[model samples]
Target: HMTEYKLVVVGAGGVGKSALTIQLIQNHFVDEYDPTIEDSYRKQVVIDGETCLLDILDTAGASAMRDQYMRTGEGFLCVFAINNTKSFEDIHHYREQIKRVKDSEDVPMVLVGNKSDLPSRTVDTKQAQDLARSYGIPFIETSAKTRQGVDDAFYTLVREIRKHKEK
Candidate 1:
């Protein structure tokens, strides 16, 4: 009854990576912002009634630390801000880097646009989905503050990682 996954949460600065990770595991939002270096959380999650442990690495959005995060992660949660156009565009670079570093185009990853509950959304869902289509991955929108779409994104990532392991 033990399934473990190393999931990396990546994005540029101010894209809500830490918030999403914390909300996913803690179910509460802390209205504070701090530049991250690296934070790891181990959560016991139940997927289809099976016991699982999710090791989530919430990165600092430092460009220098990107590749190493890519290297160890069994799955990736590529996050962006629905309100930030730059964050959305960064996903393309991330996907390319992940592919190059992992040496596989078929990387287990999800394209997520966080801050869905925000008042302003510059990067639309279709745009994100279109990019995801190019990489052949799933696209999801999440609002960590409101607790919307968080479970879907995380569960999908874990399931994808499991599928990759099976293959």
Candidate 2:
């Protein structure tokens, strides 16, 4: 059986939202110096022996239009760059907005700490883990450059969405 999932990646600019998506979709990473507007990507894969279709909305482009996408997303990856304190701080805004838009506290989401490949990190792992624990969501670190946890980030959201629906 094939189930379609609507996923959204939300984070501040320069946080590697597109990079993660591209790595998951294309199996390679690209450097993007310019800012993104908005992007949509589709992929079909198997997660836990179940065929799943993922339609991802990369909202790294325009924050002004975030509410619109937030309303439609079935699951979300609240992303942050571990090296940027500001980006880590911004995860709260995105998570809050998602709940506000969905009008539910139990939205399926994963807290992502991107740029894990970087040498210096402004946000500590324990801090991020504690935040995720408080939110009652799973937390994972990813590096689009190294392809670390990129697929897991997406696949975990799929599992979360499934659990949410079956509840």
Candidate 3:
């Protein structure tokens, strides 16, 4: 039987939530960063010989909508722009909010530093890793334009959920 799973993507405004999701599920990317409220998509993935369904909720600057989804979500992708230190700093707020909204203390989460293709990255990979280490989660770098590390982020996150499920 195929297992059904839920995931939510969250971050501050203009951090590429929609672009990231579109890049992964839709297999396309757009450099334009417009205002997007929410994008829900379903994709079936065969992970390690198991067929699974991903109900991914991409929340574009909507914390309330994100809060609603966090309770039932199996995993979360807390993304930020590497070039923007402010976005990296805002990740703590998102993580704290997720801890408060979610019922469990051990929710599967990936702190993704997006915009890897851009230059002038203000947040170093080491700094981001330290933060992710504090939260005991994985840190992933993704570039929606060139599509680097996009699949890795999603697959690793779903595996995290799978590992969580096993426990």
Candidate 4:
């Protein structure tokens, strides 16, 4: 049987959560989508020489049901816009809640800084690196507009999930 990764994208408003999701699945950029609904996207790709399916749940505007999705997801891409400090601050809450729901201190996750193409960045790479270092997770900077590091951000999570499961 083939493997499937249940990944969820979590972030604050205007952090390009949907944009990154669409860019990875569609390879197109629109900055915004139907902001009111949570959507699911699936893609089959090769990761580490193995064929796998990625079932991604875009939890952009569905904060009310965060725990439900958090419990179902095997891994997460905790995203924030580099240009916005507020979104960066919101990432901790998501990480905390994920750990609580999963009942584990360590989980398969990644910290993503989206909107790397933007000229104005309020959050520095060193700061994000420190945050990720504290969490013991990988961090990536991605620009959905240019598709920079978008695939790596998601694929890294898949590898993390697989690594975590090996234990």
Q: Which candidate should be chosen as best, given TM-score against the real structure? A: 4
Candidates 3 and 4 compared: the better one by lDDT is 4
Global fold similarity of model 3 (TM-score): 0.92
Position 54, candidate 1: lDDT? 91
Candidate 4 lDDT by residue in tens digits, 90-116: 999999989989899799999999999
Superior candidate under TM-score, 1 versus 4: 4
lDDT values for all models: 0.85, 0.88, 0.85, 0.89
lDDT of 4 at 68: 62
List TM-score per model, in order: 0.92, 0.93, 0.92, 0.94
User: Which digits, one per residue and each the tens of the lDDT, describe model 3 over residues 1-167?
Assistant: 78887889888877788888889887899777567657678989888888988899988643565566777888999999999889888998888878887755688999999999999889999999999998899999999988999988888899999888861
Summed over model 1, clashes come to 0
Off by over 4 Å in 1: 61-69
Q: What C-alpha lDDT, on a 0 to 100 scale, does residue 91 get in candidate 1?
A: 79
- Per-residue lDDT for 12-124 in model 1, tens only? 88888888888988999767757755778899988977788998889884454556657878999999999999888787787778888888998899999999888868987
Candidate 4: clashing pairs of residues: none
Ranking by lDDT: 4, 2, 3, 1
- Which portions of model 3 show Cα errors greater than 4 Å? 63-67
Compose the digit string of candidate 2's lDDT tens values, residues 1-167.
68788899889989999899989999998887346558778999988988888889888554555666677789999999999999988888988888888888899999999999999799999999999998999999999999999988998999999899961
